[PDB]
Amino acid sequence: LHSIISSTESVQGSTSKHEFQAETKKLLDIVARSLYSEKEVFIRELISNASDALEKLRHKLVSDGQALPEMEIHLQTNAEKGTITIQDTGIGMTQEELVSNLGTIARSFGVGFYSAFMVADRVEVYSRSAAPGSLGYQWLSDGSGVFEIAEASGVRTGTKIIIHLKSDCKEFSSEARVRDVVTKYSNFVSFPLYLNGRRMNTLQAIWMMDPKDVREWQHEEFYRYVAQAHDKPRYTLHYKTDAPLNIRSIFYVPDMKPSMFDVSRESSVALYSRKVLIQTKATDILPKWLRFIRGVVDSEDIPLNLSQESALIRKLRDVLQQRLIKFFIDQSKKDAEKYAKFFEDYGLFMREGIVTATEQEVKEDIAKLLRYESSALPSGQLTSLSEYASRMRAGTRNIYYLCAPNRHLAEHSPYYEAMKKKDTEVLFCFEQFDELTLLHLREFDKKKLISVET
Numbered sequence: 001l002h003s004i005i006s007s008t009e010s011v012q013g014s015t016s017k018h019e020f021q022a023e024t025k026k027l028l029d030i031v032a033r034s035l036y037s038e039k040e041v042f043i044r045e046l047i048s049n050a051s052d053a054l055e056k057l058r059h060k061l062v063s064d065g066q067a068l069p070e071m072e073i074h075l076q077t078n079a080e081k082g083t084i085t086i087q088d089t090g091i092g093m094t095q096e097e098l099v100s101n102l103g104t105i106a107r108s109f110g111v112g113f114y115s116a117f118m119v120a121d122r123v124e125v126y127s128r129s130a131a132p133g134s135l136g137y138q139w140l141s142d143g144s145g146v147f148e149i150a151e152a153s154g155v156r157t158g159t160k161i162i163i164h165l166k167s168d169c170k171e172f173s174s175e176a177r178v179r180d181v182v183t184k185y186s187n188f189v190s191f192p193l194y195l196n197g198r199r200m201n202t203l204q205a206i207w208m209m210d211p212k213d214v215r216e217w218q219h220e221e222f223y224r225y226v227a228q229a230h231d232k233p234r235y236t237l238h239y240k241t242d243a244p245l246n247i248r249s250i251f252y253v254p255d256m257k258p259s260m261f262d263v264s265r266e267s268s269v270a271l272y273s274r275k276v277l278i279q280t281k282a283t284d285i286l287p288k289w290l291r292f293i294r295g296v297v298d299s300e301d302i303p304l305n306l307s308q309e310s311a312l313i314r315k316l317r318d319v320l321q322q323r324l325i326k327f328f329i330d331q332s333k334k335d336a337e338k339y340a341k342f343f344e345d346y347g348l349f350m351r352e353g354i355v356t357a358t359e360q361e362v363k364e365d366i367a368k369l370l371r372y373e374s375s376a377l378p379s380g381q382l383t384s385l386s387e388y389a390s391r392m393r394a395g396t397r398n399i400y401y402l403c404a405p406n407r408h409l410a411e412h413s414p415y416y417e418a419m420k421k422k423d424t425e426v427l428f429c430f431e432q433f434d435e436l437t438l439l440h441l442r443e444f445d446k447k448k449l450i451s452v453e454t
């Protein structure tokens, strides 16, 4: 076993009593009076803060020329004392930060603070800043208007938080319960995590890496994990952006064709906020028509305690829809043959998306993915609507199409045969849902879609 948590700290003198500012007292009073059904979330908040403190220290030490100490997160349960403790060897807090900041700090407020009092009769904290010459401090509070601070000896650099659990929260002093909570929400924490001296099995959050650094074998492993799949991904989009929102995401299209299970999926993409799980499922992380996509979306703009269907989620969904459409357009130009197979396999999702979309601009965006045969191209070759539009002859302002079972029947339509005399291109559409798709699309790039047979 590898444990660092023990009672090394002592206080030589008396504590100083301070009162919380009224607004922090306000939020603490809300916590004491409220009914929370998801009390386990304090653990993921504490682990996230510990990770942030370790990253702050590591980046600072590497920026200087300094050796790196042991950088770890430890949890300890004590059923006899009814406690759960977290300790990390990160940057710690100064006395000023303990006195003034607690309750009002952002994560990108008070993460780990209000949620600790949700489960605690009282909280006992030791912290010592990593800055040279820093002294250790003890901070104590029962979550009422008062907290205490005192200089403490025997404090290790970093922070230790001891939660003396409430009567109805003793489940968090059981190792097995805590282990399951960690695995559920905190499995991708990026520093070593130990529970009661045992290293926890955690996973690598490859979505946080620079896209150019992730190799195909790593994507294949991660795809198989997140999709619970045995094939390989036919497409991979690793999308990282800082504007208008923070996004670190990986999207995969399966090699296999869609089955009845992918069409009826309840859970397509997992949602994280800086490596803290928010939902294994995805309400509408992506549009419904993109439910065939597997993978992960991480946005630190997502706050840690939620319930969704917010403006933030809607904005994220719209950004991701545009980026995925752009990706598929880019893939069609990189490898048209592979894209044609993707459209054959997954194109009913695009047609669905056009039919169900509310906004004309979204319909036309999705329609950029459609590929059809054309009277003007060799049998079997596909064209896009924009390529058709680029070939339109002066004086002809509509996009003409014909739905038929196959190319032979299309070419022998008496309507098409007559039109051929005047050079007008006609799209040939062989999928049974093409009629509805193009009826709903109605127009593309301000050009009306006209079926050459009524």
Ligand SMILES: O=C(c1ccc(O)c(C(=O)n2cc3ccccc3c2)c1)n1cc2ccccc2c1
Pocket (backbone or CB within 6 Å): 045, 046, 049, 050, 052, 053, 054, 056, 088, 090, 091, 092, 093, 102, 111, 112, 113, 114, 116, 123, 125, 127, 139, 158, 159, 161
């Ligand atoms: O959740 C925490 C917490 C946990 C682990 C930590 O390591 C720190 C810390 O020392 N940090 C975190 C940082 C993140 C970014 C930069 C520096 C940082 C220093 C803070 N609470 C501490 C409490 C103290 C009192 C009450 C509730 C509390 C909850």
Ligand SMILES: O=C(c1ccc(O)c(C(=O)n2cc3ccccc3c2)c1)n1cc2ccccc2c1
Pocket (backbone or CB within 6 Å): 415, 452, 453, 454
């Ligand atoms: O009155 C018609 C009608 C009559 C003759 C037609 O030839 C067409 C047609 O399909 N065209 C005409 C074209 C002229 C130029 C180019 C292409 C063209 C395709 C349509 N209805 C069809 C109905 C179908 C259902 C219900 C009422 C309907 C009435």
